[PDB]
């Protein structure tokens, strides 16, 4: 096992990771990111 | 005019600016001139990867 | 008055430029700098054209300038400084080395504009390269990659 | 930084010099 | 050449790490039902039918 520099954050009752990776993946490269859907009204 | 050793001496002086259709860029200076003496350089200033 | 003489360097604004001598600069051309910049790349599946990786050159070129400053000296200075019209007497001697007073106490503040005005210049190009603000935050966030 | 031996020679003869 | 060729091959490898998130990413999102249905659901309800 290793060690490794991420954020750690606890909610409710339980500890959980908080990923918002935009800059180590889907940066400078032509792939849109996922989690900008879109909605119809 | 840039200095450097002839490579090879020339000879027959003969009239040059008479058969002048040969060459591809003919230059007389009368005795000297300021464009001999320049020294425009072009430089690059380092690369980054 | 002693003004205070200011050394760019010990400004704060020294951060933002790297700053090296260069005696032939009045013979170059067009000084060019180079750059390659690779892009990376991930895999998906499905109706996706497959993609590959991708390489950018850009290269910029050097934008001169210059600086100029000025320097009086009246007749009389000159007419004591070229010992011209002398007579040999402790009379003139005095105006001489007021002369001479008037000359360096000037030179020093001339000298002096050059550093001062490294800064302006410095601020004037900052000024001329900088997009505004409300314009270029919106635009580096809404669009994710570009085309 | 100033140019000197085969970077002089280059800007002399053939009109470029490279850091 | 060769230089060109590894550059690129190490970028080509990458992509296959880069890409194994955006398909866990894909198959989570088309996984999860909404939090606005699927908190009344488990809650209204005991148990179902």
Redesign the interface.
């Known amino acids: 096992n290793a060690r490794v520099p991420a954020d750690l954050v606890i909610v409710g009752d339980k500890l959980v990771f908080l990923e918002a990776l935009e800059r180590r993946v889907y940066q400078a490269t032509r792939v849109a990111y996922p989690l900008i859907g879109n909605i119809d009204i | 005019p840039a200095g450097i050793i002839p490579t090879g001496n020339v000879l027959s002086t003969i009239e040059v600016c008479a058969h002048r259709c040969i060459f591809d860029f003919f230059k007389q200076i009368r005795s000297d001139d300021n464009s001999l003496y320049s020294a425009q350089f072009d430089i690059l200033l380092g690369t980054y990867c | 008055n002693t003004l205070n003489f200011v050394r760019f360097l010990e400004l704060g604004l020294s951060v933002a430029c790297i700053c090296?001598?260069?005696?032939?600069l009045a013979?170059?051309?067009?000084?060019?700098?180079?750059?390659?910049?690779?892009?990376?790349?991930?895999?998906?599946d499905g109706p996706h054209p497959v993609?590959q990786?991708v390489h950018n050159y850009m290269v910029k070129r050097?934008h001169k300038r210059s600086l100029s400053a000025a320097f009086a000296i009246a007749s009389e200075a000159l007419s004591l400084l070229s010992n011209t019209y002398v007579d040999g007497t402790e009379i003139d001697s005095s105006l001489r080395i007021r002369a001479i007073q008037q000359m360096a106490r000037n030179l020093r503040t001339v000298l002096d504009s050059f550093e001062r005005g490294t800064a302006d210049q410095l601020l004037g190009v900052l000024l001329e390269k900088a997009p505004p603000l409300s314009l270029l935050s919106p635009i580096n966030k809404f669009q994710?990659?570009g085309? | 930084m100033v140019l000197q031996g085969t970077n002089l020679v280059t800007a002399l003869v053939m009109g470029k010099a490279v850091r």
């Open positions: 090296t001598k260069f005696p032939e013979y170059v051309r067009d000084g060019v700098i180079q750059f390659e910049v690779q892009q990376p790349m991930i895999a998906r993609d990786p050097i994710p990659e085309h």
